[PDB]
């Protein structure tokens, strides 16, 4: 489905370390962040999304409109300027973050009460699975 609204609690995280290292996150932050629980709260109304990512450590809000490019400065992550664009490919939400790193972005799929998130950077993919609370 296209409807991603909900509070989503992480159940599995595969290769998060490799994706962080591909973004050049400092080693000591990687070791703290690598096995943190994550909750994603998604508020979706038409094209407008408000996504809140929370863990006991860093705590992000990003807001976007599907089909509208936006500047992002990833101040709490690798501290880069990207031009981000979120679109639908059928029922799959696709984000491309254009900038220094190649193949940088993410894709979200919803099956049932499961949200699948694939984060990419370079040759690394991180696969996360969330359950709807």
Protein model, in words:
InterPro entries: Calycin (IPR012674), Fatty_acid-bd (IPR000463), ILBP (IPR031259), Lipocln_cytosolic_FA-bd_dom (IPR000566). It is found in: Cytoplasm. By secondary structure, this protein is mainly β. It has one domain: Calycin beta-barrel core domain (Lipocalin, Beta Barrel), CATH 2.40.128.20. The protein is 11% helix and 55% strand. It contains two helices and ten strands, in the order E-H-H-E-E-E-E-E-E-E-E-E. Strands 4-3-2-1-10-9-8-7-6-5 form a ten-stranded antiparallel beta sheet.
- Give the biggest sheet: 10 strands, antiparallel
Structural class by helix and strand composition: mainly beta
| Strand line-up in the sheet with most strands | 4-3-2-1-10-9-8-7-6-5
- Portion of residues in helices? 10-25%
Q: Rg, please?
A: 14 Å
CATH topology assignment? Lipocalin
CATH class: Mainly Beta
CATH architecture: Beta Barrel
Number of domains: 1
What is the beta-strand fraction? over 45%
The strand count comes to: 10
Multimerization status: monomer
Overall 3D geometry?
A: globular
The ordered H/E elements are EHHEEEEEEEEE
Distance between the termini: 17 Å
- According to CATH, the homologous superfamily is Calycin beta-barrel core domain
Helix tally equals: 2
């Amino acid at each position: 489905t296209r409807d991603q609204n909900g509070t989503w609690e992480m159940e599995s995280n595969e290769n998060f370390e490799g994706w962080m290292k591909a973004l050049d996150i400092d080693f000591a932050l990687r070791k703290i962040w690598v096995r943190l629980t994550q909750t994603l709260v998604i508020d979706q109304d038409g094209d407008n999304f408000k996504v809140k990512c929370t863990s006991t450590f860093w705590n992000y809000d990003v807001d976007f409109t599907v089909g509208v490019e936006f500047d992002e400065y990833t101040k709490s992550l690798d501290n880069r300027h990207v031009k981000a664009l979120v679109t639908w490919e059928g029922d799959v939400l696709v984000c491309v973050q254009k900038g220094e790193k190649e193949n940088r972005g993410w894709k979200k799929w919803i099956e049932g009460d499961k949200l699948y998130l694939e984060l990419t950077c370079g040759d690394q993919v991180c696969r996360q699975v969330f359950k709807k609370k």
